[PDB]
Structure 1
Amino acid sequence: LSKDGDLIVSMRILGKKRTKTWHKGTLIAIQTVGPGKKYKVKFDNKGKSLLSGNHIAYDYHPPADKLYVGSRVVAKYKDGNQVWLYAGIVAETPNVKNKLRFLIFFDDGYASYVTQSELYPICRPLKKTWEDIEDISCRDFIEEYVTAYPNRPMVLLKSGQLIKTEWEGTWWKSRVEEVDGSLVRILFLDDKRCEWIYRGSTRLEPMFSMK
């Protein structure tokens, strides 16, 4: 083979490394594997991988109209000075409440608002898009979320409010610093760490109790 749909050897493409971050390279071969095909990527950053269609993504930003709740995407994550690419699911499309942004639920349970220009469409997602989410607890939340979807139980929080927030099986004293749409920035008082958290997460005590 040399083409499969719009996947064509020598094209630029994004590929998921075994580390779970995604990296730019070139599609150097396509390979038939039984019923379907696999896609061989040579990474700009030196390695090579033979990948299924749901572990590559196009090197362009999608049009924010083909994005729906449940869409499989790769999104930029800004860990301070570095920027990484990581997979997730579109949880919210742009609107007035979220200030015309996309809410992304990443495959490791993190959540963040991003713009169309920080997103890449996965080439061949699965029919049920959450089924290649490796972490089972995250996969299950996504499946419940997308299935209930328009239903989205959240907790009302106000800046300064004192609550307990879960982290690593412990409940910690914390304070609400800020609310941005469906997220809340939480300050943990013991170690002064901050963390953005979906307002429907049971890690927030008022959400834990409501349930």
Structure 2
Amino acid sequence: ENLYFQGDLIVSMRILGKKRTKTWHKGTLIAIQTVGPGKKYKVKFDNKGKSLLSGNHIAYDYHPPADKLYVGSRVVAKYKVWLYAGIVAETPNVKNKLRFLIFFDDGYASYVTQSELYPICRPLKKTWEDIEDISCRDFIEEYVTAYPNRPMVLLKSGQLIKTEWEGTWWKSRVEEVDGSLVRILFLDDKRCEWIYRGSTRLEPMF
């Protein structure tokens, strides 16, 4: 069937759609199609292209109200401007200076504000099941289902640790801590990465 209405979606509405590049772009919802119990959403993008997308690959073009976001919520976020999919790992609280922690689909982690988030329209019941990278997906499943149980290592600036990267362990130094993230300076290449403090990549007890 072709539909004009589907839940709160309406043909002609402004929307964000996922492109093959994995970045998300503004468009218009031009069709809603049912195929058995399945639903597809045709989007005409503002610049280039039409795509027929599943509901987990479109997002509303507005910012979610804070109380509609949970740990595990599936979102599109400003990735640092590009828009990229992720999972909410933390909601605003005193310890994170009232920000959202996002774990992006490629494994990048960043704190963002509500103004940098868009809610996915039809997330999967298990929101992580459309994360393409299996390693990332498994990590998110464990994190979201274990929450609020979050084993983390307590790190302090100046601390020398080993950190994993590309399958090996690198001499490194804790530069800064920001909520549940730690900025690690890798001594070999003198470059930094922000890493979640519950990451098994962090080894203080070498």
TM over 0.5: yes
For residues 30 and 183 of structure 1, what CA distance do their matches in structure 2 show? 41
**What do the CA deviations read for 1:145-193 (whole angstroms, capped 9, x no partner)?**
1111110000011111111111111211111110000000111111111
2:57 corresponds to which residue?
Answer: 55
The equivalent of 1:167 in structure 2 is 165
Task: Report the CA distance between 1:197 and its aligned residue.
Answer: 0.3
Q: For residues 46 and 13 of structure 1, what CA distance do their matches in structure 2 show?
A: 14
Q: TM-score, normalised by structure 2?
A: 0.95
Q: 1:45 to 1:173 in 2, by over 3 A?
A: farther
Distance apart, 1:129 and its partner CA: 0.9
Contact 2:17 2:59 in 1 (8 A): yes
Distance 1:207 1:84, change over 3 A: farther
Asked whether the 8 Å contact 1:154–1:207 carries over to 2, the reply is no
1:36 partnered with 2:38: yes
Structure 2 CA distance, aligned partners of 1:69 and 1:86? 17
The 3-state SS of whatever aligns with 1:26 is strand
Figure out how many residues of one structure are paired with residues of the other and give that number. 204
Instruction: Look up the SS of the partner of 1:145 in the other structure.
Output: helix
- Whether the 8 Å CA contact 2:161–2:205 is kept in 1: the answer is no
How far does the alpha carbon of each residue in 1:107-146 deviate from its partner, in whole angstroms, 9 at most, with x for none?
Answer: 1111111111110000001111111111111111111111
SS of structure 2 residue aligned to 1:74:
strand
Per-residue CA distance 1:68-100 (angstroms, 9 max, x = gap): 11111111112xxxx111111111110000000
Q: Alpha-carbon deviations, 1:13-38, whole Å to 9, x = none?
A: 00111111111111111111221210
Distance 1:128 1:95, change over 3 A: same
Aligned counterparts of 1:127 and 1:198: Cα–Cα separation in 2: 25
C-alpha displacement at 1:45, in angstroms? 2.5
Q: CA deviation at 1:206?
A: 2.9
Deviation at 1:207, TM superposition (A): 8.1
**Cα pair 1:93 1:101 within 8 Å, conserved:** yes
Query: Any runs of at least 4 consecutive aligned residues in structure 1 with deviations exceeding 2 A, and if so which?
Result: none
The answer for unaligned runs of 5 or more in structure 2 is: none
Q: Secondary structure at the match of 1:207?
A: coil
Gaps of 5+ in 1: none
